[PDB]
RNA sequence: UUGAACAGAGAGCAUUUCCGGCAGCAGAGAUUUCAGCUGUU
């Protein structure tokens, strides 16, 4: 359970399944007693019954505009640049991929406890 | 993840591990790619509107004998009230510009009658009498300001026409720019330099000296933000306001060039000279495409429309051309079909201002418009597939409202691009230095590299090797000791010799032992 | 095969296609 | 000739009644968008900006603090807003912070109260009445472990006693205290650890590792048979109550100070360490560590995890509070104040929202989790643009100057001083360890997360 | 503990809602959180309403304003409880119920064992909202003018406690 | 966006649409576009509940021709794809939001209660449970809403407990309208009668009880006067022994209503049932005495008892001592009452047993005739 | 702590059961529709 937590890539909190109880209908009554005289009395009966020159120049002002190195997850170069490679942004996506890669992996109920998890 | 049809503009270029962890992650990279191209092309089925058409219906039917009196009957009311005519016989000739909504129209006379209007609804915004020389105008980042390239020095006015700046950097501009992401103003002239203003902070961005006389034509790269300039030599130049010397040097036209336009995508651009000569060019490849030759007389405009289309103005002609912009040699613009020749790209529209001369071109966007400056006004030709039908509310609303422009200039000045980030490739944001190293180095890798870095000076590593199988004329050591300074004597030098009289030694024995 | 009539009916107010009413406005003339 | 135009009916665009928005046409097309790459960077980059303005993580203190400095801080595991604070003049305090305020304080022992924790007694011959009353548990230097009562004003379903139920007596001083978290058993250390039962008044075993004092202990959450313990003998000790026995032992370089075991994961704990570091350990293998946590000054004095397990707080001898990521060995941000001394005691909120530190100066302190967060709810599209900033921040934080806008903190000038000084002075051991690697042809590269430990007791 | 369900005591009737959203209560003092009861935005993502049941009359009214004020239980209320709060087990897990008055919850608590009553500073925080905002949250199924109805009914409790004579 | 989330939803269906071949590009298009206007109306301001109304006719005449298309071109029923539940899934889902938005617009919970009903294959009894359960709890007071559901489940479920339950839990919210109680009792005796008539079919096929008796109806009767007569009071509260006449009075229509379908009820022991009632009537009510307090309905109910004493049987069989018995006990009622009063009940009792016999049986054609002739002139 | 009986919820999981083909009969609803039965595939 905690390499399927570790390597699933959302989670959301409770992971524990809650209890749940039987939801409150018109169909049934919920009490079990009658709590009404008529529940009564009918519950007794029912009972009862050249051209192109390119300068080559290092552009110096571009520099902090790029990466230094290949950063740390990644072991080279094509792996970072293809992490690059979509814009988050909704203006070069759809509305439902961009709520796709906007939605963090950690997320949490606002004001409730969070528990350590159950063994299954 | 089902493969579509239209996938292939939604695509984009980039420039077997053990860890399990990158495995994953990057497969997740990959499939998040995959289903977002998908789903961003799946969604040409909202696109409300479709582009215009011109189609001949019979052999005899050709699309550029259709006149504008017909296509005005032939369209709907809206379009043809759209298609306005200004006779301002006085102050001309008349160089026009447009907003980036197309909202606004922005004429300027040579003698100083320059005017900001609301076209379609007919509301005069400002109306100037300078009683001077002016050649150009432009909008700023709304319909709200603009600025004036008048005699000497350019001049920035507002919504109603009150002067708040005269910017005395800017000297005798005879072309001027706006770039929308960056805010930067800029301008070029007779004295043969670029500017670039900030006007969202006043600064001066840059000040770069094309040494080429003074600039005939200037146009934006609209896809990076990169200025091609047009001088006199013959040669466009590719500038960025961070690098004083150009990106790129095109030998366009043998003559001074006449006018550049680029499209929207950024990857063709079209040059006339005064030779006569219209060449259209690969922007990102840097090879030319076509070279119309000898046209009748020299173009003295371009434009290029967001579909696509290719307009020329050469004195009083506009002709048209369509999917002129393509590789094949079948899209090269022609004017006479030989014998009906359907691999002949003969003209798609072409239109006679008799008695005038086009002073300027101008696409109105996101309509089947081409507006005309000329020496009498303004003329507006209903084009059938010049404008993108389907724009984006986002970037630009031709329905826009006052809160919204209200909005979107704080949201634009907050999102403004800094001026170093304009390069040739606009991915270059977020990339590795090409100096740095490929591959990643951690600890152990950086210490065995100092410490073959240290044992090279023992392994003498660092001066070439000996080859007796090479001649001493083309030998790298002869080469490394003449590169050296012959004064100073150091000790690399001393080894570098030593090897070399070695070498000589060796390759005289065996010259020796064959004769 | 041909479009039934109840089938152009239902294309007509599926499509929103205004050409009946077109040919209305071109047919209405001195009718009373 | 087919002549057909744009032609664009103004019903589509303007809406006609003036109750309605504005539609909004979008066009996927990249040309119609361009600068994708420095557009989003632009946008990261006033996020990190911003977040940098918003950085404002001081909540508030609690009450009026304690007379001495605070030195046992235990959390209510089920109840959000309820702490318990101890300090050195045997003052004990049970707080809401809701309100911010006590509902109770006693003067509970006259030593030194050594250890707090938060119980839910279970006794054989009757219930207690949870719902309304809080229990907790104490240990002083006086020879004693109380446990109280105190009334709690969640429920309103009725219209008792607060103060001492039972007092354990033991013959030595007592240095720490946990509970089990569903027995009603605990533990309280000192000279010899002792596992008692609150139906008993005296120890139901001894679980000591020979003849040295025990100064911490700590249960495992989820395997709530196991224990933990640290002693003044640079030594970590796990328990299990199934074998009842001192399971195996670790001995580092310097003594532990407290330790916190992972919510989300059962086998994995943190150590807090006199190295200036912590230490995040695997139970199965403690031949080494999993991370080290370096970025304090002075000694770690205490540890917290996050309930979600991704992150740890560390209180430092430095005045200072560092919130680190598990997956890195540095910290995310730090804490301090002018008016902060000497943090002996950090805990997460159950909410992983906010941070309880108790001081040298008798303060107790509430700090959030998140520096730039607040608690209000959000829209949808106030939530959906944090969500993009964030996701956004993480995918160019390897850029030059949004790095060095999203480090930058300011620090206190003795803290600053002191890592200059510890940075020549690692510098000063890295060239003597070049020097000895100069000079002997094979010598062994021993891991950053294997040089804390001295040994261990079974060999693996 | 989470407030799971909301009971508002409404002149004209009854009203039960459901909690989508707990707001966080170890800074419920702060200014985001005090500021999210007056925006109308922020506290529906909190609140949404389950149920009403509207009086039948003015004389059922003032009898259900007696009730409240004595803190009985009246009949509708058992009615609208029972049919909105789900089933729960006394012994584990109640079913959390926010009130406005402290004293109504023993009452709640012995019709409805399954039931625990909450009225901290929370929950006195969300029928604050609730009052204020009113009207809006009920979605048009309010059928009378709530103002006048208030009215009346406080002339009518006012009427009925002093016993008024108009002899 | 909502809507751009909306229409990305809508994408799959289109993408089925085009990949058989019954819909165009184009086409699609078109179908899109009405489909932004209408999502635009439902996710932004000032929208009504009509723009829900106009997008479910919309998509119904989109599905009618989605099915003209695929029986025309594909000559299949229904594609085995996407397609053919797509837009009743949409259909439900703008009635769902429809009436989360607008929940107080009873005419668009019928129409979504309809539809439901009405794609009975493909929906589920757990669906129509959930939207009565919502719609229940946001209107309690709706009597109608009740009885609606008693009868889905009592029709199409023949689930009487459910039925029961939700009678009773109906009366608990309801109970001072007389409709609900009406109701009940009309369940509480077809039941009874489903259950005598399956014991007949089962004497039938092979080779008492207070149930089969009716005293459930009977218990839920007099609960039913007790109540409405309490919450009659409570609604219109000397003048208060007037108010007593007026409750009483108002009590013995529903009475007399009850009466009536219990003659529409002629399986049941209608004998039994009318000695019920009025036995309830002879019994004292409000304080008051029933016959000095309304003696014209005291007179009314004898009549009615005399009347129904024979009236049960048929005119053509009728019992001669059966009718000398009815015209003896008023014969007894005219000397108990007062002359007016005798007058009275004895030209109601002529006109009755005129209507009854003399209408249907001619003194001629039946010799007992001419005596009911002699009878009626006595009388 | 477990078992049994009872009352359930719609709220989870599984299905290697059946039904979303056709023909025919018959009923009901608002000429069509609806589920059902009998065959067949």
């Given at each position: 359970i905690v390499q399927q937590n570790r390597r699933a890539d959302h989670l959301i909190f409770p992971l524990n399944k809650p209890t749940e109880h039987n939801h409150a209908s018109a169909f049934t009554r919920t009490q079990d007693v009658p709590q009404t005289e008529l529940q009564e009395k009918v519950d007794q009966v029912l009972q009862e019954s050249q051209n192109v020159i390119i300068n080559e120049k290092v552009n110096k002002k571009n520099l902090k505009y790029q990466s230094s190195a290949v950063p740390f997850p990644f072991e080279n170069r094509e792996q970072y640049e293809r992490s690059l490679?979509?814009?988050?942004?909704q203006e070069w996506t759809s509305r439902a991929s961009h709520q796709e890669l906007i939605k963090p992996r950690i997320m949490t109920k606002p004001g409730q406890v969070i528990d350590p998890l159950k063994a299954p | 993840i089902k493969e579509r049809e239209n996938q292939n503009k939604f695509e984009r270029s980039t420039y077997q591990t053990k860890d399990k962890k990158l495995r994953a992650g990057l497969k997740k990279i990959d499939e998040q790619y995959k289903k977002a191209v998908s789903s961003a092309a799946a969604?040409?089925?909202?696109?409300?509107e479709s582009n215009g058409y011109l189609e001949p219906e019979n052999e005899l039917e050709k699309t550029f004998k259709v006149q504008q009196s017909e296509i005005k009957s032939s369209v709907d009311v809206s379009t043809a009230n759209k298609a306005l005519d200004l006779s301002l016989k006085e102050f001309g000739p008349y160089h026009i510009k447009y907003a980036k909504n197309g909202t606004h129209l922005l004429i300027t006379g040579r003698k100083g009658h320059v005017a900001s209007m609301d076209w379609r609804k007919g509301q005069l915004r400002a109306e100037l009498f300078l009683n001077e020389t002016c050649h150009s105008a432009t909008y700023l980042q709304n319909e709200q300001y603009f600025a004036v390239a008048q005699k000497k020095y350019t001049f920035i006015y507002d919504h109603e026409g009150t002067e708040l700046h005269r910017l005395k950097q800017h000297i005798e501009a005879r072309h001027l720019d706006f770039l929308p992401y960056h805010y930067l103003l800029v301008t070029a002239g007779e004295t043969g330099w670029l500017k670039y203003h900030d006007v969202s902070t006043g600064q001066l961005v840059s000040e770069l000296r094309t040494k080429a006389g003074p600039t005939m034509a200037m146009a934006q790269n609209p896809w990076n933000a990169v200025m091609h300039l047009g001088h006199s030599n013959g040669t466009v130049s590719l500038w960025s306001p961070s690098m004083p010397e150009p990106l790129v040097k095109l030998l366009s036209a043998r003559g001074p060039v006449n006018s550049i336009a680029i499209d929207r995508s950024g990857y063709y651009m079209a040059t006339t000279g005064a030779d006569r000569s219209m060449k259209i060019w690969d922007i990102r490849n840097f090879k030319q495409l076509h070279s119309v030759e000898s046209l009748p007389t020299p173009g003295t405009n371009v434009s290029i429309s967001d579909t696509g289309l290719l307009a020329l103005s050469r004195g009083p002609h506009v002709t048209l051309w369509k999917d002129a912009l393509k590789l094949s040699g079948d899209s090269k613009p022609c004017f006479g079909s030989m014998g009906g020749n359907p691999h002949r790209n003969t003209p798609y529209m072409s239109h006679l201002f008799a008695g005038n001369k086009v002073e300027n071109l101008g696409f109105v966007p996101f309509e089947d418009l081409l507006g005309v400056g000329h020496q009498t006004g303004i003329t507006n030709l209903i084009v059938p597939g010049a404008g993108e039908a389907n724009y984006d509310a986002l970037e630009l609303?031709?329905?826009?409202t006052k809160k919204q422009r209200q909005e979107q200039e704080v949201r634009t000045l907050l999102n403004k691009l800094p001026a170093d980030t304009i390069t040739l490739d606009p991915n270059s944001i977020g990339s590795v230095d090409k100096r740095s190293s490929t591959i990643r180095l951690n600890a152990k890798d950086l210490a065995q590299t100092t410490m073959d870095a240290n044992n090279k000076a023992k392994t003498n590593s660092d001066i070439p090797d000996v080859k007796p199988d090479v001649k001493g004329k083309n030998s790298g050591l002869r080469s490394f000791l003449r590169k050296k300074t012959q004064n100073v004597i150091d000790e690399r030098k001393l080894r570098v010799q030593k090897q070399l009289d070695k070498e000589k030694n060796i390759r005289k024995r065996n010259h020796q032992i064959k004769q | 095969p041909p479009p039934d009539e109840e089938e152009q009916l239902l294309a007509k107010f599926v499509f929103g296609d205004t050409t009946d009413l077109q040919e209305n406005l071109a047919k209405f003339n001195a009718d009373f | 000739m087919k002549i057909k135009t744009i032609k664009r009916s103004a019903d589509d665009y303007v809406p006609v009644k003036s109750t309605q928005e504005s539609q909004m046409p979008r066009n996927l097309n990249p040309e119609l968008h361009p600068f994708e790459r420095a557009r989003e960077y632009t946008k990261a980059l006033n996020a990190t900006k911003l977040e940098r303005m918003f950085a404002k993580p001081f909540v508030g203190q609690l009450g009026?603090?304690?007379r001495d400095g605070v030195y046992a801080i235990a959390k209510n595991y089920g109840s959000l807003n309820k702490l318990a604070t101890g300090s050195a003049d045997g003052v004990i305090k049970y707080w809401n912070m809701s309100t911010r305020e006590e509902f109770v304080s006693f003067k509970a022992h006259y030593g030194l109260v050594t250890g707090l924790c938060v119980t839910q007694p279970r006794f054989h011959d009757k219930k207690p009445d949870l719902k309304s009353q809080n229990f907790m548990l104490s240990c002083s230097d006086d020879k004693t472990v109380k446990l109280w009562s105190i009334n709690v004003d969640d429920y309103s379903n009725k219209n008792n006693e607060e103060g001492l139920i039972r007092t354990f007596d033991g013959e030595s001083a007592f240095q720490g205290i946990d509970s089990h978290r569903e027995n009603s058993t605990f533990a309280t250390g000192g000279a010899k650890i002792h596992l008692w039962d609150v139906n008993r008044l005296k120890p139901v075993s001894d679980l000591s590792w020979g003849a040295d004092n025990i100064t911490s202990l700590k249960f495992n959450q989820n395997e709530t048979d196991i224990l933990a313990s640290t002693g003044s003998d640079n030594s970590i000790v796990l328990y299990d109550l199934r074998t009842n026995s001192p399971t195996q032992k670790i001995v580092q370089t310097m003594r532990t100070n407290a330790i916190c075991w992972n919510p989300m994961e059962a086998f994995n704990f943190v150590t807090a360490n006199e190295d200036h570091n912590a230490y995040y350990y695997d139970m199965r293998n403690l031949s080494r560590s999993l991370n080290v946590f370096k970025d304090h000054v002075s000694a770690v004095m205490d540890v917290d995890f996050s309930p979600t397990g991704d992150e740890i707080v560390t209180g430092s001898y430095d005045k200072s509070i560092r919130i680190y990521k598990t997956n890195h060995g540095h910290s995310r941000e730090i804490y301090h104040t002018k008016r902060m001394q000497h943090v002996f005691q950090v805990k997460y909120s159950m909410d992983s929202k906010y941070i309880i530190s108790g001081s040298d100066d008798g303060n107790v302190r509430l700090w959030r989790s998140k520096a730039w967060e607040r608690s209000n709810v959000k829209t949808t599209r106030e939530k959906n643009k944090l969500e993009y900033d964030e996701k956004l921040k993480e995918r160019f934080r390897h850029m030059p100057e949004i790095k060095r806008i999203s480090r930058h903190r300011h620090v206190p000038q003795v803290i600053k001083k002191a890592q200059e000084i510890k940075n020549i002075e690692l510098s000063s051991i890295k060239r003597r360890e070049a020097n000895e690697r100069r000079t002997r042809k094979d010598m062994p590269y021993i891991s950053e997360r294997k040089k804390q430990i001295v040994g261990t007791v079974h060999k693996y | 503990a989470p407030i799971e369900y909301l009971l508002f005591e409404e002149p004209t009737g009854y009203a039960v809602f459901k909690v989508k959203l707990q707001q966080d209560d170890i800074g419920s003092r702060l200014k985001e959180v005090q500021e999210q009861i007056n925006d109308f935005g922020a506290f529906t993502k909190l609140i949404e309403l389950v149920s009403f049941a509207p009086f039948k009359g003015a004389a059922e009214a003032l009898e259900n304003a007696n009730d409240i004020s004595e803190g009985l239980v009246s009949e509708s209320l058992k009615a609208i409880l029972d049919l909105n709060l789900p089933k729960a087990s006394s012994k584990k897990k109640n079913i959390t119920l926010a009130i406005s008055d402290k004293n109504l919850g023993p009452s709640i608590k012995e019709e409805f064992p399954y039931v625990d009553c909450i009225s901290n500073e929370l929950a006195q925080d969300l029928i604050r909202g609730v009052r204020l905002h009113?009207?809006?949250?009920?979605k048009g199924l309010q059928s009378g003018d709530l103002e006048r109805a208030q009215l009346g009914l406080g002339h009518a409790y006012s009427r009925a406690k002093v016993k008024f004579s108009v002899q | 966006s909502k809507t751009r989330y909306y229409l990305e939803q809508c994408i799959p269906e289109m993408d089925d649409l085009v990949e058989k071949g019954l819909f165009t590009k184009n086409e699609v298009s078109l179908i899109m576009k009405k489909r932004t206007d209408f999502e635009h109306r439902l996710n932004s301001r000032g929208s009504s509940i009509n723009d829900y109304i106009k997008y479910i006719n919309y998509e119904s005449n989109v599905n009618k021709l989605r099915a003209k298309r695929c029986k025309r071109i594909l000559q299949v029923k229904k594609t085995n794809s996407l397609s053919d539940w797509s837009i009743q899934q949409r259909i439900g889902f703008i009635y769902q939001r429809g009436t989360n938005k607008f929940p107080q617009d009873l005419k668009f919970w019928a129409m979504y209660l309809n539809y439901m009903k009405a794609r009975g294959n493909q929906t589920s009894y757990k669906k129509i449970h959930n939207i009565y359960n919502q719609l229940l709890k946001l209107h309690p007071t709706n009597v109608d809403i009740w009885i609606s559901c008693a009868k889905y489940e009592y029709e199409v479920h023949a689930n009487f407990k459910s039925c029961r339950n939700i009678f009773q839990n109906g009366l608990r919210f309801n109970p001072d309208v007389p409709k609900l109680w009406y109701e009940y009792v009309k369940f509480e005796l077809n039941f009874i009668t489903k259950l005598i008539n399956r014991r007949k079919v089962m004497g039938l096929i092979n080779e008492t009880n207070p149930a089969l008796r009716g005293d459930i109806a009977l218990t839920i009767f007099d609960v039913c006067m007790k109540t409405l007569g309490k919450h009659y009071i409570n609604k219109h509260k000397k003048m208060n022994i007037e108010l007593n006449k007026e409750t009483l009075n108002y009590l013995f229509s529903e009475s007399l209503r009850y009466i009536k379908l219990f003659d529409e009820f002629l399986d049941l022991e209608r004998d039994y049932l009318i000695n019920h009632v009025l036995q309830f009537w002879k019994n004292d009510m409000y304080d008051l005495s029933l016959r000095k307090d309304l003696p014209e309905l005291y007179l009314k109910t004898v009549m009615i008892d005399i009347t129904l004493n024979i009236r049960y049987m048929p005119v053509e069989k009728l019992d001669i001592d059966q009718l000398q018995l009815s015209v003896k006990k008023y014969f007894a009622y005219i000397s108990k009452l007062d002359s007016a009063s005798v007058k009275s009940l004895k030209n109601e009792y002529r006109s009755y047993l005129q209507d009854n016999y003399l209408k249907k049986m001619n003194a001629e054609d039946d010799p007992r005739y001419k005596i009911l002739d002699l009878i009626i002139s006595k009388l």
């Open positions: 490679r979509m814009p988050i942004g | 969604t040409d089925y909202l696109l409300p609303n031709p329905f826009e | - | 009026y603090g304690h | 009113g009207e809006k949250l009920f | -």
